[PDB]
Design an enzyme around this catalytic site. Sequence first.
Site, short mmCIF file in Angstrom:
data_model
loop_
_atom_site.label_atom_id
_atom_site.label_comp_id
_atom_site.label_asym_id
_atom_site.label_seq_id
_atom_site.Cartn_x
_atom_site.Cartn_y
_atom_site.Cartn_z
N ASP A 1 -6.34 -11.10 18.83
CA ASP A 1 -5.31 -10.27 19.46
C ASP A 1 -4.20 -11.15 20.08
O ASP A 1 -4.32 -11.62 21.22
CB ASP A 1 -5.93 -9.34 20.51
N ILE B 1 2.54 -10.00 11.41
CA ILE B 1 2.30 -9.23 12.61
C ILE B 1 3.64 -8.80 13.18
O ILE B 1 4.59 -9.60 13.22
CB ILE B 1 1.53 -10.07 13.66
N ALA C 1 6.34 -2.82 18.26
CA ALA C 1 7.15 -2.40 19.41
C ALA C 1 6.76 -0.97 19.78
O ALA C 1 6.79 -0.09 18.93
CB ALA C 1 8.62 -2.46 19.07
N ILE D 1 9.42 -1.02 0.46
CA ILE D 1 8.31 -1.73 1.11
C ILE D 1 7.36 -1.06 2.14
O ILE D 1 6.88 -1.70 3.08
CB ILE D 1 8.65 -3.22 1.43
N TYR E 1 15.88 1.17 14.62
CA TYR E 1 15.13 -0.07 14.37
C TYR E 1 15.23 -0.54 15.83
O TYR E 1 14.27 -1.04 16.41
CB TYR E 1 15.69 -0.98 13.25
N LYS F 1 13.39 -9.58 15.59
CA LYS F 1 13.37 -10.28 14.32
C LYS F 1 14.43 -11.37 14.34
O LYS F 1 14.28 -12.34 13.61
CB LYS F 1 13.56 -9.34 13.12
N1 LIG Z 1 9.33 -2.37 5.17
C1 LIG Z 1 8.44 -2.99 5.96
O1 LIG Z 1 7.38 -2.46 6.30
C2 LIG Z 1 8.78 -4.37 6.46
C3 LIG Z 1 9.98 -4.95 6.09
C4 LIG Z 1 10.28 -6.22 6.59
C5 LIG Z 1 9.38 -6.87 7.43
N2 LIG Z 1 8.23 -6.28 7.78
C6 LIG Z 1 7.32 -7.04 8.64
O2 LIG Z 1 6.12 -7.43 7.95
C7 LIG Z 1 5.00 -7.44 8.86
C8 LIG Z 1 3.87 -6.50 8.42
O3 LIG Z 1 4.16 -5.11 8.59
P1 LIG Z 1 3.82 -4.02 7.44
O4 LIG Z 1 4.42 -2.73 7.91
O5 LIG Z 1 4.19 -4.53 6.07
O6 LIG Z 1 2.22 -3.89 7.48
P2 LIG Z 1 1.50 -3.30 8.79
O7 LIG Z 1 2.44 -2.36 9.51
O8 LIG Z 1 0.14 -2.82 8.34
O9 LIG Z 1 1.29 -4.59 9.71
C9 LIG Z 1 1.07 -4.33 11.09
C10 LIG Z 1 0.15 -5.37 11.69
O10 LIG Z 1 0.49 -5.52 13.06
C11 LIG Z 1 -0.64 -6.20 13.62
N3 LIG Z 1 -0.65 -6.21 15.10
C12 LIG Z 1 0.03 -5.40 15.94
N4 LIG Z 1 -0.23 -5.74 17.23
C13 LIG Z 1 -1.09 -6.79 17.22
C14 LIG Z 1 -1.79 -7.65 18.22
N5 LIG Z 1 -1.63 -7.47 19.56
N6 LIG Z 1 -2.61 -8.64 17.75
C15 LIG Z 1 -2.80 -8.85 16.43
N7 LIG Z 1 -2.21 -8.12 15.47
C16 LIG Z 1 -1.36 -7.10 15.80
C17 LIG Z 1 -1.88 -5.61 12.97
O11 LIG Z 1 -2.82 -6.67 12.74
C18 LIG Z 1 -1.33 -4.99 11.69
O12 LIG Z 1 -2.03 -5.43 10.51
C19 LIG Z 1 5.58 -7.09 10.22
O13 LIG Z 1 5.87 -8.35 10.84
C20 LIG Z 1 6.84 -6.30 9.89
O14 LIG Z 1 7.83 -6.30 10.93
C21 LIG Z 1 7.90 -5.06 7.31
C1 LIG Z 2 12.47 -0.19 6.17
C2 LIG Z 2 12.48 -0.30 7.67
C3 LIG Z 2 11.65 -1.08 8.62
C4 LIG Z 2 10.51 -2.01 8.40
C5 LIG Z 2 10.44 -3.29 9.22
N1 LIG Z 2 9.08 -2.93 9.69
C6 LIG Z 2 8.94 -2.97 11.11
O1 LIG Z 2 9.58 -3.83 11.70
C7 LIG Z 2 8.11 -2.16 11.82
C8 LIG Z 2 8.02 -2.28 13.15
C9 LIG Z 2 7.17 -1.45 14.07
C10 LIG Z 2 7.25 -1.74 15.43
N2 LIG Z 2 6.53 -1.06 16.33
C11 LIG Z 2 5.69 -0.07 15.97
N3 LIG Z 2 5.02 0.57 16.95
C12 LIG Z 2 4.24 1.63 16.75
O2 LIG Z 2 3.69 2.18 17.70
C13 LIG Z 2 4.02 2.19 15.36
C14 LIG Z 2 4.63 1.37 14.21
C15 LIG Z 2 5.57 0.27 14.64
C16 LIG Z 2 6.31 -0.43 13.67
C17 LIG Z 2 9.20 -1.60 9.06
O3 LIG Z 2 12.10 -0.77 9.87
C18 LIG Z 2 13.18 0.15 9.70
C19 LIG Z 2 13.95 0.74 10.70
C20 LIG Z 2 14.96 1.63 10.33
C21 LIG Z 2 15.19 1.93 9.00
C22 LIG Z 2 14.42 1.34 8.00
C23 LIG Z 2 13.42 0.45 8.38
#
Ligand SMILES: NC(=O)c1ccc[n+]([C@@H]2O[C@H](COP(=O)([O-])OP(=O)(O)OC[C@H]3O[C@@H](n4cnc5c(N)ncnc54)[C@H](O)[C@@H]3O)[C@@H](O)[C@H]2O)c1
Ligand SMILES: Cc1c(C2CN(C(=O)/C=C/c3cnc4[nH]c(=O)ccc4c3)C2)oc2ccccc12
Lengths: 258, 244
Positions: A64, A92, A95, A192, A156, A163
């Site tokens: 964690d 990871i 928010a 994604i 966002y 980020k």
């Molecule tokens: N379109 C997208 O989803 C997208 C685009 C660009 C970047 N990202 C980034 O990629 C990464 C993975 O997100 P995802 O949405 O693809 O899969 P995801 O949302 O399943 O990943 C979320 C992860 O957050 C971790 N997490 C949260 N709080 C934690 C804590 N206190 N300790 C340990 N782990 C913790 C969990 O282990 C979990 O697997 C993130 O950094 C996200 O911002 C996602």
């Molecule tokens: C695609 C896309 C993303 C991607 C990038 N990924 C993230 O950064 C996610 C962050 C995030 C942050 N905090 C979170 N807290 C939660 O309680 C539940 C889910 C949760 C997700 C998802 O964010 C957007 C915001 C506006 C529009 C499009 C996107």
Amino acid sequence: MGFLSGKRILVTGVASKLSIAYGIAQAMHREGAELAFTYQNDKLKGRVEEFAAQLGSDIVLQCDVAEDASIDTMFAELGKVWPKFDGFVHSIGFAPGDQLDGDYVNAVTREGFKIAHDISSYSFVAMAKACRSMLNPGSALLTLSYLGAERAIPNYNVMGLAKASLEANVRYMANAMGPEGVRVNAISAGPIRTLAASGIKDFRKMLAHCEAVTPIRRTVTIEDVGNSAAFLCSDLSAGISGEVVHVDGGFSIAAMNE
Amino acid sequence: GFLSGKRILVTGVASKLSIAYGIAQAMHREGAELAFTYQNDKLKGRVEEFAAQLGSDIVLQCDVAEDASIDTMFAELGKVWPKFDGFVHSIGFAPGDQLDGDYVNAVTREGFKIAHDISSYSFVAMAKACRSMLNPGSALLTLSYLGAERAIPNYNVMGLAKASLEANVRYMANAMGPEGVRVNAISAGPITLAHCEAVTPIRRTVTIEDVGNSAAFLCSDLSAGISGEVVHVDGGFSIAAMNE
Ligand SMILES: NC(=O)c1ccc[n+]([C@@H]2O[C@H](COP(=O)([O-])OP(=O)(O)OC[C@H]3O[C@@H](n4cnc5c(N)ncnc54)[C@H](O)[C@@H]3O)[C@@H](O)[C@H]2O)c1
Ligand SMILES: Cc1c(C2CN(C(=O)/C=C/c3cnc4[nH]c(=O)ccc4c3)C2)oc2ccccc12
Ligand SMILES: NC(=O)c1ccc[n+]([C@@H]2O[C@H](COP(=O)([O-])OP(=O)(O)OC[C@H]3O[C@@H](n4cnc5c(N)ncnc54)[C@H](O)[C@@H]3O)[C@@H](O)[C@H]2O)c1
Ligand SMILES: Cc1c(C2CN(C(=O)/C=C/c3cnc4[nH]c(=O)ccc4c3)C2)oc2ccccc12
């Protein structure tokens, strides 16, 4: 043999089968990588343990990243098997739900700011400090980022106040660590969609446009991401450190269409 | 006076050397009505003294660490400027500790939090607290460095906060634009505070007057078409490489 033959890589943030980091793993293991896995809390143990089963790796450990001690003890246990290893994947980010709401100014709070920058940005270097001594020469780090870090995207909000913070984190890291033979990079994934849209609103429509507007006319996949990640974590990218590579299909390079 | 008829709150004055001092100096020079903040009983003295020099005397205690201090200063200011046209964010902190040697070694959890907290979160926070007092064609400003964009040795976690701050600027602009508010950052070069000259295109560092007149501009309606923008007032150091 596939490349990253010979390598030991720890992969964080594997919530599901559609979890992106599941893709990063796949690509890596598919290329003969010995992996290790962390889960967040007992709720995700399961479960991720099983995914690691699939990918041929025993190592399954809680971590964690809120707590310095949890990261410490994680790695300490990992040392029991991997006296040294070759890098980790930082997938990871978090928010508090409320944080990613409507108007940015409205929604953002000091605590929401705190947590988002702690968990999505600091944590990455936190891990690097704890396992710095355990990195072989020629090991690489990677983390995952979004276009939010570069531009203002509604709802966002604070995520890339993070980020962006995390994007520089890459650089300074890559800077401090090269001397000792370490590369720090990051992938700007397109969307994604994984467990992350659990706070993102307006999502169903969000993907179509931007699919008609991405140069390649499809969203990138966990395979597409897994694939650039594996290269960015293999010695094929020996001359890439400190770079934020975009894997969005070229989305961020177009404008005004249509 | 191309800044005339405007009411701007300058923060972070602490000396003659301060960036905010040139900004204010430059801002009064263009007939702006100014207000100031101090953060310490320490600083109250000097800030008040410069107030008199620059013809104004709205001077209030504000520490951007405490969401409470913030709102009280705004409240106190509303009494005299019920509404006004924006503020300058000449603040940054890292308990450093942090800006000494290897980055990864230096940096800590708390250290990361404190830097980000004061150097970046503060800027939006104030913006929340005075959303309501902002007249259309308002302008917020904040002072950044190149460490955001590139990894400078010893800047360490500050780099990341400025990165976060510049991010913040882009968001703030986007959130506040529909109400006539513009937000921008000056990525200022080297010059309270804490040999580029050979490599700098203009062959000298930027000066408080340089930065001064840019802030002034960015906060005037002359810079009407600019928002969410990080203007490099660094003498073109940003954009050059390997000058022997
Ligand atoms: N379109 C997208 O989803 C997208 C685009 C660009 C970047 N990202 C980034 O990629 C990464 C993975 O997100 P995802 O949405 O693809 O899969 P995801 O949302 O399943 O990943 C979320 C992860 O957050 C971790 N997490 C949260 N709080 C934690 C804590 N206190 N300790 C340990 N782990 C913790 C969990 O282990 C979990 O697997 C993130 O950094 C996200 O911002 C996602
Ligand atoms: C695609 C896309 C993303 C991607 C990038 N990924 C993230 O950064 C996610 C962050 C995030 C942050 N905090 C979170 N807290 C939660 O309680 C539940 C889910 C949760 C997700 C998802 O964010 C957007 C915001 C506006 C529009 C499009 C996107
Ligand atoms: N002159 C430079 O070295 C330089 C170069 C580029 C950017 N900057 C940026 O310009 C800004 C101002 O720095 P400077 O060089 O003008 O002098 P400075 O850094 O001494 O002034 C900063 C001011 O911040 C105030 N402050 C500190 N903590 C505070 C808090 N918790 N709440 C409210 N106020 C607080 C102090 O009153 C102080 O005068 C900083 O953001 C800095 O990053 C400075
Ligand atoms: C420095 C510093 C800051 C802020 C103020 N900011 C700055 O003005 C930074 C200037 C700077 C930062 N890094 C630099 N790096 C260089 O290599 C050469 C020039 C150079 C200049 C950083 O807050 C502090 C709080 C406590 C203690 C020190 C600082």
